[PDB]
Structure 1
Amino acid sequence: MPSMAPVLKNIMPAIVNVAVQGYLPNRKFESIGSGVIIDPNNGVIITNDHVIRNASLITVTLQDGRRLKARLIGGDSETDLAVLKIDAKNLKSLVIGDSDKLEVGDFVVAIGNPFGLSQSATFGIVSALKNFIQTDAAISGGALVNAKGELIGINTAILVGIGFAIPINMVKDVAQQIIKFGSIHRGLMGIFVQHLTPELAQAMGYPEDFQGALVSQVNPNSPAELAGLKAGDIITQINDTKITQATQVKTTISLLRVGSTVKIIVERDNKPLTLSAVVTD
């Protein structure tokens, strides 16, 4: 008589209810969702972008009951993710798997905490892997877990029998990014860029006066890594455009069609480099 309770038991402490006493910008509301703690030490919670939208107040009911004060570390509408910290003790966490293992047909359960007093679970499979995960489990900002009961995704209800989650890998990338900066910008060919602060600039033996976008992380098999591009590079110049702003790469790129051969001047180990690169529909 197989059952999913055995693993569910294990992975439900690390689920939190989330209430957002917010006003609606120039009428009150109370948006409420669920969330998940990925670091128990630094007490990091993840949740939906849209839940903490317009948040004046941010409160996290633990599973053991501890109603709490949360802090918006950061957001990512680009993937509806959102990072929070709660200052607290005796916090339990359960395992994170690796999305890269996800086959379709793999069994999952979507878990949440819609009412703070409690739990909630649905069942289906990985339906499709489009960067969405698709699933026939019913739907948010909660855990998605595999048949081993490992945290492999985070749930995001949007616009039926079609659940939708975000891989925990992609979700770790934005989080850890958002933690380390007012972060997560995303740009060309699966790369993550940040602002080259003076403090960074010089930290890397460069000058404070020096400028570019800072390639923070290049995701493998990205046309960027293909283009020869790595983390710690400083895009000085996409084509004719002097890149001295981090969000230029994007606005710059967006205004160029697919099948177009682009020249990124990166600045690595104190020397310029053109990089043969290519845009893709």
Structure 2
Amino acid sequence: MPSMAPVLKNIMPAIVNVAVQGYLRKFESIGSGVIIDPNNGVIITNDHVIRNASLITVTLQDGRRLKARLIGGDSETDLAVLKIDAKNLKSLVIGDSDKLEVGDFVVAIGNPFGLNSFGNSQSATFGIVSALKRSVENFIQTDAAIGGGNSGGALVNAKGELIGINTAILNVGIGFAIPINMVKDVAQQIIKFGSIHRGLMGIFVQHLTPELAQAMGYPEDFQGALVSQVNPNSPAELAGLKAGDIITQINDTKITQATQVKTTISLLRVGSTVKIIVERDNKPLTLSAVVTDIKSHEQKLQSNNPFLYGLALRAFEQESPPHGNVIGVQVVGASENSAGWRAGIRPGDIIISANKKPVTDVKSLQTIAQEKKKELLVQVLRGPGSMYLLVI
């Protein structure tokens, strides 16, 4: 007689209750957690379960109510790692969430927002994987949900292995899970450093469909991640990556799915050399690239183009009463965080001279901006009036 009872009875102690008290006004909040290292008391829940906590208490199936410590959380991946100091703890076999398919049977273990606050008992619910993660697009999706779903709890496969960590967004009958492969890596890194310090690579990637594979000269079943854009002066550009490359391996991981790429890179730390294997018009190339600090990169960009950085510019000529024939460069956009904004330049402004010299096109503006001076004097037409501005 088949039943999930045997596997669940063994893994249930691994799931726990997570209770939080805090101020936002004082509030309560409860969710679930999973013990992923029994020897050191390391529990995973969602970041949103424990945000704003002054107090966090873990209740085990065995009855103990334990004071827990936050080792660190990561709001973007919605994960948080906790420590409790206690012995005789149980966990479960961790699995590989890259190996999941639509149609596999799963069980989600974790109380809904309403339920069994008081019993040391975690509700179980059964179903299949309905759709794989694809960044609702951001998670493993299931039809195993109860009460609008669980946060912090375990998603396990038919064997009892942990394949993800549940989460509850506000989809009737649909359950969501953060895949365990990603969870592992944010756990290690929060454990070692206390938080993820994301750096910059500058690679935008897209799902390689069979359609696109074939149109790009590869078989229908070919797998990889399509590079859709490589920014200028980005680490990916230094490394030789081009739009149209198909990424097939990063470091030790084979890429068969664009969603893979974006997770790996994310959780990788400024300083890391990264091996990227690429296919380009059917030739393999191995590029190497260094993750850099986002604020450093913005610095480079700024001190390289100190007066015009953050501005979108185009050539402009137009008879424009009351000014007569107006020739210049139109500021089409401007980041609030630019020397240009700070000096007063706004979108819609026409720059008609720089350092008292006439400006005809963008190039002509960029050249004068290269002049080794402390400041750029800029004359702008703005609708029917005009200002001189100083860009420092």
Query: CA-to-partner distance for each residue in 1:101-142, whole Å, 9 max, x for gaps?
Result: 111100000001569992201111111113421111105210
| Residue 174 to residue 213, structure 1, CA distance change in 2 (3 Å) | farther
Alpha-carbon distance between aligned partners in 2 of 1:267 and 1:223, rounded to the nearest angstrom: 18
Query: CA-to-partner distance for each residue in 1:64-110, whole Å, 9 max, x for gaps?
Result: 01000000111111111110000111111111111121111000000
| Residue 73 to residue 216, structure 1, CA distance change in 2 (3 Å) | farther
Conserved? CA contact 1:61–1:116, under 8 Å: no
Alpha-carbon distance between aligned partners in 1 of 2:86 and 2:229, rounded to the nearest angstrom: 31
For residue 142 of structure 2, what is the aligned residue in structure 1? 135
- Structure 2 unaligned residues grouped into runs of 5+: 116-120, 293-392
For residue 284 of structure 2, what is the aligned residue in structure 1? 272
Alpha-carbon distance between aligned partners in 2 of 1:63 and 1:221, rounded to the nearest angstrom: 54
TM-score by length of 1: 0.67
| Residue 142 to residue 271, structure 1, CA distance change in 2 (3 Å) | same
Alpha-carbon distance between aligned partners in 1 of 2:54 and 2:92, rounded to the nearest angstrom: 30
When structure 1 is superposed on structure 2, of 236-245 and 251-260 the one drifting more is 236-245
| Residue 60 to residue 265, structure 1, CA distance change in 2 (3 Å) | same
Conserved? CA contact 1:106–1:146, under 8 Å: yes
When structure 1 is superposed on structure 2, of 256-265 and 193-202 the one drifting more is 193-202
| Residue 158 to residue 190, structure 1, CA distance change in 2 (3 Å) | farther
| Residue 260 to residue 55, structure 1, CA distance change in 2 (3 Å) | closer
Conserved? CA contact 1:184–1:194, under 8 Å: no
| Residue 33 to residue 235, structure 1, CA distance change in 2 (3 Å) | same
| Residue 222 to residue 49, structure 1, CA distance change in 2 (3 Å) | farther
Alpha-carbon distance between aligned partners in 2 of 1:75 and 1:149, rounded to the nearest angstrom: 26
Conserved? CA contact 1:185–1:194, under 8 Å: no
Conserved? CA contact 1:17–1:116, under 8 Å: no
When structure 1 is superposed on structure 2, of 71-80 and 182-191 the one drifting more is 182-191
| Residue 46 to residue 235, structure 1, CA distance change in 2 (3 Å) | same
| Residue 180 to residue 231, structure 1, CA distance change in 2 (3 Å) | farther
Conserved? CA contact 2:214–2:220, under 8 Å: yes
Query: CA-to-partner distance for each residue in 1:239-275, whole Å, 9 max, x for gaps?
Result: 9999999999999999999999999999999999997
For residue 238 of structure 1, what is the aligned residue in structure 2? 250
Shift of 1:186: 3.6
SS of alignment partner, residue 36 of structure 1? strand
- Structure 1 unaligned residues grouped into runs of 5+: none
When structure 1 is superposed on structure 2, of 234-243 and 28-37 the one drifting more is 234-243
SS of alignment partner, residue 53 of structure 2? coil
For residue 70 of structure 2, what is the aligned residue in structure 1? 72
| Residue 98 to residue 29, structure 1, CA distance change in 2 (3 Å) | same
Conserved? CA contact 2:186–2:267, under 8 Å: no
Conserved? CA contact 2:141–2:174, under 8 Å: yes
C-alpha root-mean-square deviation of aligned residues, in Å? 13.2
TM-score by length of 2: 0.49
When structure 1 is superposed on structure 2, of 51-60 and 177-186 the one drifting more is 177-186
Shift of 1:163: 1.1
| Residue 188 to residue 62, structure 1, CA distance change in 2 (3 Å) | same
When structure 1 is superposed on structure 2, of 231-240 and 192-201 the one drifting more is 192-201
For residue 104 of structure 1, what is the aligned residue in structure 2? 102
Alpha-carbon distance between aligned partners in 1 of 2:39 and 2:156, rounded to the nearest angstrom: 22
| Residue 241 to residue 88, structure 1, CA distance change in 2 (3 Å) | closer
Conserved? CA contact 1:186–1:192, under 8 Å: no
| Residue 120 to residue 182, structure 1, CA distance change in 2 (3 Å) | same
Shift of 1:46: 0.5
| Residue 272 to residue 57, structure 1, CA distance change in 2 (3 Å) | farther
Query: CA-to-partner distance for each residue in 1:152-195, whole Å, 9 max, x for gaps?
Result: 11001112222110111100000111000022134446999999
Alpha-carbon distance between aligned partners in 1 of 2:58 and 2:122, rounded to the nearest angstrom: 14
| Residue 222 to residue 19, structure 1, CA distance change in 2 (3 Å) | farther
When structure 1 is superposed on structure 2, of 117-126 and 53-62 the one drifting more is 117-126
When structure 1 is superposed on structure 2, of 227-236 and 103-112 the one drifting more is 227-236
Shift of 1:230: 18
For residue 154 of structure 1, what is the aligned residue in structure 2? 165
SS of alignment partner, residue 48 of structure 2? coil
SS of alignment partner, residue 73 of structure 2? strand
When structure 1 is superposed on structure 2, of 195-204 and 126-135 the one drifting more is 195-204
1:145 to 156, 159, 173: 156
Alpha-carbon distance between aligned partners in 1 of 2:71 and 2:217, rounded to the nearest angstrom: 29
When structure 1 is superposed on structure 2, of 113-122 and 51-60 the one drifting more is 113-122
Query: CA-to-partner distance for each residue in 1:177-223, whole Å, 9 max, x for gaps?
Result: 10000221344469999999999999999999999999999999999
Identity of aligned residues (%): 100
| Residue 199 to residue 165, structure 1, CA distance change in 2 (3 Å) | closer
Alpha-carbon distance between aligned partners in 2 of 1:243 and 1:102, rounded to the nearest angstrom: 15
Alpha-carbon distance between aligned partners in 2 of 1:190 and 1:104, rounded to the nearest angstrom: 32
Alpha-carbon distance between aligned partners in 2 of 1:40 and 1:221, rounded to the nearest angstrom: 45
Paired residues, number: 278
Radius of gyration: which is bigger? 2
| Residue 176 to residue 230, structure 1, CA distance change in 2 (3 Å) | farther
